[PDB]
Amino acid sequence: LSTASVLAFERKLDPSDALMSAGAWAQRDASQEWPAVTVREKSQTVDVANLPSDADTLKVRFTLRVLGGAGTPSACNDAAYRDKLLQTVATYVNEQGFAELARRYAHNLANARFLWRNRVGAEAVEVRINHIRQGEVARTWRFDALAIGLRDFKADAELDALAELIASGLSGSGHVLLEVVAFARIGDGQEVFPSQELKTLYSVRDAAAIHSQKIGNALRTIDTWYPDEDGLGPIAVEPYGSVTSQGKAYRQPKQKLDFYTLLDNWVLRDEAPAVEQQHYVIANLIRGGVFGE
């Protein structure tokens, strides 16, 4: 029994492109006719997007789909390796649910980490999360994103209910569609930071916006078990867990803590790792990607 030559997993927790609009604070519950943040050009010629001078609140909006079936690959050569991986994920699910992973995901939804440079320097940020069952709303969560820090994984009853919903979606017991709105208080006429294209800025039609993969990168920033340090905090889950800014890679394959050697020891040789490393492996499976030769 060896690993398959092709092996591919579709991503779970699909986000949409987060759209930007502007408004004034305490109109946040009436933020349905809020005008979008227009990108303009100025003098080299640079495209910059700012808030209007009578607005201090940036509203970003996206939707997130939680689907389930995180063990089944979308393509696989070997059927024996596929059955071994499926029963490995089955014993992982029967040992513990998705509660730790959905807890960290609801933490990353609670704090506005998807606002990358729009959250820093903000005097107040607030996150409204709607569970939308039919075409109308079914549940509302209200979170102070400045209260939930970016370093520690806290505990809260509303956060635990949201995490139980996300874990129900990850286990295939129901279909989850969430709407995430975030309000950030920056000031009048300050600049916002949408994603930049290959200086040009990302735009859905006449509106500044963030890429969906940016929101997905912020959402999976849950990896707190890399063996170098833990005082820095969580990083995104990656095989050879690395970051583009520092130019350095944790989970180096000389150490036996990258995703690939963990998966090969767990599935092939039945060397089940630590439960935190099991969380890391299943988080990389929920992230998806192309694994194999």
């Binding site: 990358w116 959250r119 320097g121 300050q190 600049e191 820095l232 800014s245």
Partner: protein, 187 residues
């Protein structure tokens, strides 16, 4: 100035150190505008003049009450998860002193074209033969990126730490913390 506070950039995968120090210097500038005054100094004790790096540290020099008031102000809101704090303590003895100066360049010929053409009513060819393209000065100084709030502009502010002296003399500081005659103790 007797009292110093060391704040250290918490290392971040999410944000680069230069960016972190740029937004820290920007909020320091807005805090110094909000307080005013000219007795508020800055230093960077992690200098590396080989690669012109600013390091990771920010040492603010003032009195005890200025630093203790500047701790409890909203210029540190939204940032305190990203940096580690120190204590306002006294400078040890003995230490040398040096300055913190902004050194710009006339690295843009076009601005001197605009100045010499707006003050004299020259032509473009007269300003082009008057000042050539070789007037651009190259710099090996560290700098932190800053933005503008009202009318938006992006520029790099070069900081130069002056020569080490044995004694310090009187003098003011801007709202950037840079030296206008007053020196900071270097340690």
């Amino acid at each position: 100035m007797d009292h110093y506070l060391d704040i250290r950039l918490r290392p971040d995968p999410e944000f680069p150190p230069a960016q972190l120090m740029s937004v820290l210097f920007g909020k320091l500038h807005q805090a110094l505008v909000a307080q005013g005054g000219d007795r508020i100094g800055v230093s960077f004790p992690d200098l590396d003049e080989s690669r012109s790096r600013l390091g990771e540290r920010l040492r603010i020099h003032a009195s005890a009450d200025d630093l203790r008031a500047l701790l409890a102000r909203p210029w540190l809101e939204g940032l305190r998860d990203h940096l580690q704090f120190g204590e306002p303590a006294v400078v040890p003895h003995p230490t040398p002193y040096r300055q913190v100066s902004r050194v710009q360049a006339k690295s843009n010929p076009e601005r001197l074209r605009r100045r010499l053409m707006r003050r004299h009513d020259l032509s473009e060819e007269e300003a082009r033969k008057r000042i050539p393209d070789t007037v651009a000065r190259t710099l090996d100084l560290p700098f932190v990126t800053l933005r503008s709030q009202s009318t938006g502009q992006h520029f790099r502010l070069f900081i130069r730490h002056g020569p080490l002296q044995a004694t310090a003399e009187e003098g003011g500081f801007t709202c950037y913390g840079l030296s206008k005659g007053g020196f900071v103790p270097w340690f």
